[PDB]
Amino acid sequence: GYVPEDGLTAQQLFASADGLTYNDFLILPGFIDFIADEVDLTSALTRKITLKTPLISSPMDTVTEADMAIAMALMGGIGFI
Amino acid sequence: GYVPEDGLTAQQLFASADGLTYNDFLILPGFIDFIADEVDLTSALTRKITLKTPLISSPMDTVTEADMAIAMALMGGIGFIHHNCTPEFQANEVRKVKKFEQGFITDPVVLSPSHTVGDVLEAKMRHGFSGIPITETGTMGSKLVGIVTSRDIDFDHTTLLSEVMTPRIELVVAPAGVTLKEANEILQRSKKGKLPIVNDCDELVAIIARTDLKKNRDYPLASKDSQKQLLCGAAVGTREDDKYRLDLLTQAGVDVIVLDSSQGNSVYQIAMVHYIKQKYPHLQVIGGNVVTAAQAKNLIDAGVDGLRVGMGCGSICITQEVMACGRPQGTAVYKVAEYARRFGVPIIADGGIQTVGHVVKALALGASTVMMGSLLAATTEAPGEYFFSDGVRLKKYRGMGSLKIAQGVSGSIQDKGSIQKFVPYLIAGIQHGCQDIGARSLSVLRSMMYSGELKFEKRTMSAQIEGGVHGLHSYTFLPFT
Ligand SMILES: NC(=O)c1ccc[n+]([C@@H]2O[C@H](COP(=O)([O-])OP(=O)(O)OC[C@H]3O[C@@H](n4cnc5c(N)ncnc54)[C@H](O)[C@@H]3O)[C@@H](O)[C@H]2O)c1
Ligand SMILES: Nc1nc2c(ncn2[C@@H]2O[C@H](COP(=O)(O)OP(=O)(O)OP(=O)(O)O)[C@@H](O)[C@H]2O)c(=O)[nH]1
Ligand SMILES: Nc1nc2c(ncn2[C@@H]2O[C@H](COP(=O)(O)OP(=O)(O)OP(=O)(O)O)[C@@H](O)[C@H]2O)c(=O)[nH]1
Ligand SMILES: Nc1ncnc2c1ncn2[C@@H]1O[C@H](COP(=O)(O)OP(=O)(O)OP(=O)(O)O)[C@@H](O)[C@H]1O
Ligand SMILES: O=c1[nH]cnc2c1ncn2[C@@H]1O[C@H](COP(=O)(O)O)[C@@H](O)[C@H]1O
Can you say whether residue B298 is alpha, beta or left, with left for phi > 0 and alpha for psi between -120 and 50 degrees?
alpha
Burial tier of B225 (Cβ tally within 10 Å: 0-12, 13-18, 19+): middle
Ligand 2 neighbours by CB, cut-off 6 Å: B 99, 101-102, 105, 108-109, 127-131, 150, 194, 209, 211-212
CA–CA distance, B442 with B432 (Å, rounded to integer): 12
Which residue type occupies B77?
G
Atom of ligand 3 nearest to the CA of B209: 1
Tell me the C-alpha distance between A68 and A79, whole Å.
7
CB contact under 8 A, B266 and A32: yes
* Interstrand relation of A56-57 and A78-79 (parallel, antiparallel or unpaired): parallel
Residues in chain A: 81
Q: Whose CA is nearest to atom 8 of ligand 2?
A: B129
* B407 assigned ligand-binding residue: yes
- DSSP code of residue B382: S
- Is B466 a known ligand-binding residue? yes
Would you state the torsion angle of the CA atoms of residues B67, B68, B71, B73, taken in this order, to the nearest 10 degrees? -120
C-beta of residue A72 within 8 angstroms of C-beta of residue A55: yes
Amino acid at B5: E
- Catalytic: which of B232, B313, B317, B434? B317
Other beta carbons within 10 angstroms of residue B342's beta carbon come to 8
DSSP state of B12: H
Task: Tell me which residue has its CA closest to atom 26 in ligand 3.
Answer: B181
Alpha carbon of B267: minimum distance to chain A alpha carbons (Å): 5
Strand partners, B49: B46
Residue B146, beta-bridge partner list: B134
Our answer on whether the CB atom of B192 is closer than 6 Å to any ligand 4 atom is yes
Q: Does A6 touch chain B (CB under 8 A)?
A: yes
Segments in B394-441 forming alpha helices (H): 419-437
Return d(Cα A48, Cα A6) in angstroms, integer.
39
Burial of A69 per CB tally in 10 Å (0-12, 13-18, 19+):
middle
- A7·B292 Cβ contact <8 A: yes
CA–CA distance, B218 with B101 (Å, rounded to integer): 12
In angstroms, the CA B131 to CA B65 distance is 26
CA B215 from centre of chain: 18
Question: Does the annotation flag B150 for ligand binding?
Answer: no
B311 among the known binding-site residues? Answer: yes
In the DSSP assignment, the letter for residue B353 is: -
A32 contact B CB<8A? yes
Residue B327 near residue B292, CB atoms below 8 Å: yes
Backbone angles phi, psi at B139, to 5 degrees: -130, -175
B434 a catalytic residue: no
Output the CA torsion sign for B430, B432, B438, B442. positive
For residue B237, what are the contacts with CB-CB under 8 A and spacing of at least 6? B83, B245, B259, B260, B261
Among the listed residues B59, B48, B42, B10, the one whose alpha carbon sits nearest the alpha carbon of residue B345: B48
Q: Indicate the SS3 state at residue B94.
A: helix
Q: How far apart are CA B96 and CA B160, in angstroms?
A: 30
B147 touches B196 (CB < 8 A): yes
The type of residue at B239 is R
Resolution rounded to one decimal, in angstroms: 3.9
Instruction: Round to whole Å and give the CA distance between B67 and B265.
Output: 32
Rounded Cα distance, B283 and B298, in Å: 19
Judged on CB neighbours under 10 Å (0-12, 13-18, 19+), B459 is: middle
How many C-beta neighbours within 10 Å does residue A51 have? 16
Residue of B22, B55, B58 with the most ligand 5 atoms within 8 Å of its CB, for mutation: B58
Distance between CA atoms of residues B97 and A79, nearest Å? 58
Q: Do B266 and A26 touch (CB under 8 A)?
A: no
The one-letter amino acid at A47: R
- Contact yes or no for B298 and A31 at CB 8 A: yes
